[PDB]
Amino acid sequence: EVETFAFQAEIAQLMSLIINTFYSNKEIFLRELISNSSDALDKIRYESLTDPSKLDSGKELHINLIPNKQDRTLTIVDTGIGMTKADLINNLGTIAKSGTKAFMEALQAGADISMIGQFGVGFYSAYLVAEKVTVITKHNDDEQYAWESSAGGSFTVRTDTGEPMGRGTKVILHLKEDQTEYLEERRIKEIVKKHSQFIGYPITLFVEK
């Protein structure tokens, strides 16, 4: 029921560097995830311009940020195009092998970790703040699937039994114990205002309690 896969070696190396390098500017993870959501929303919008039925799975195009201090999780939900099972296995819809090699080479030449998005592998900056990441996704052409990894060289993919999503992607960040600042409303607002001013979709920061 659950399939376990090994990361390509270059991606495992990148994840180990992200988890073990000293780097204080960890807030960039949220810019990268919101950017990915915006790109996926662009994709379903473009497909809908010639086939309106592709929005039968949901006409609203938005990004929601959902902190939960009890679970110590930050969840980012979008209603973009979503990923098929094959996309998930294929490094979450990215050419991550060649992106990670170029990025780690740039880091050798003095590049900064904040440039990770220029190399198409910004997703993995989630491991700056998260000990585990779950990605739940639904694409019009496939069933709902959950990808998960705590690094350590492997990820799992399984059919998702949770709340049906309609269409889109949910990223659940299981935060490290010393990274709970990213559950505070003021901190999230600050990061969104600083890094995501020109995202062309409504970003709703949920409140708690």
Q: Which residues here bind ligand 2GJ, judged by CB under 6 A?
A: 33, 36-37, 39-40, 43, 78, 80-83, 87, 92-94, 120, 123, 135, 137, 139, 169, 171
The residue (of 159 and 209) whose beta carbon lies closer to ligand 2GJ is 159
Q: How far is the CB of 54 from ligand 2GJ (least distance, A)?
A: 12
Q: Which amino acid is at 29?
A: F
By beta-carbon proximity to ligand 2GJ, the closer residue of 100 and 169 is 169
Using the minimum distance from each CB to ligand 2GJ, give the nearer residue, 26 or 139: 139
DSSP class per residue in 116-151? GGGGT-GGGGGGGTEEEEEEEEE-TTS--EEEEE-S
Of 67 and 93, CB closest to ligand 2GJ: 93
Two tokens at 30? Answer: 């949220």
Q: Any binding-site annotation on 78?
A: yes
Exposure string of 59-75, with b = 16+ CB inside 10 Å and e = fewer, is eebbbbbbbeeeebbbb
Q: Minimum CB separation from ligand 2GJ for residue 56, in Å?
A: 17
Contact 11, 91 (CB under 8 A): yes
Return the H-helix or E-strand segment holding 49. helix 28-50
| 123 marked as binding residue | yes
39 vs 186, beta carbon nearer ligand 2GJ: 39
Task: Name residue, tokens 């919101």.
Answer: 34
**Distance in Å, CB of 209 to ligand 2GJ, minimum:** 26
Residue 30, classified by CB atoms within 10 Å of its CB into exposed (0-12), middle (13-18) or buried (19+), is buried
CB of 200 to ligand 2GJ, least distance (A): 14
Backbone φ and ψ for 59, nearest 5 degrees, come out as -85, -20
Nearest-approach distance from CB 154 to ligand 2GJ, in angstroms: 17
- Which residue positions form the known binding site? 36, 78, 97, 123
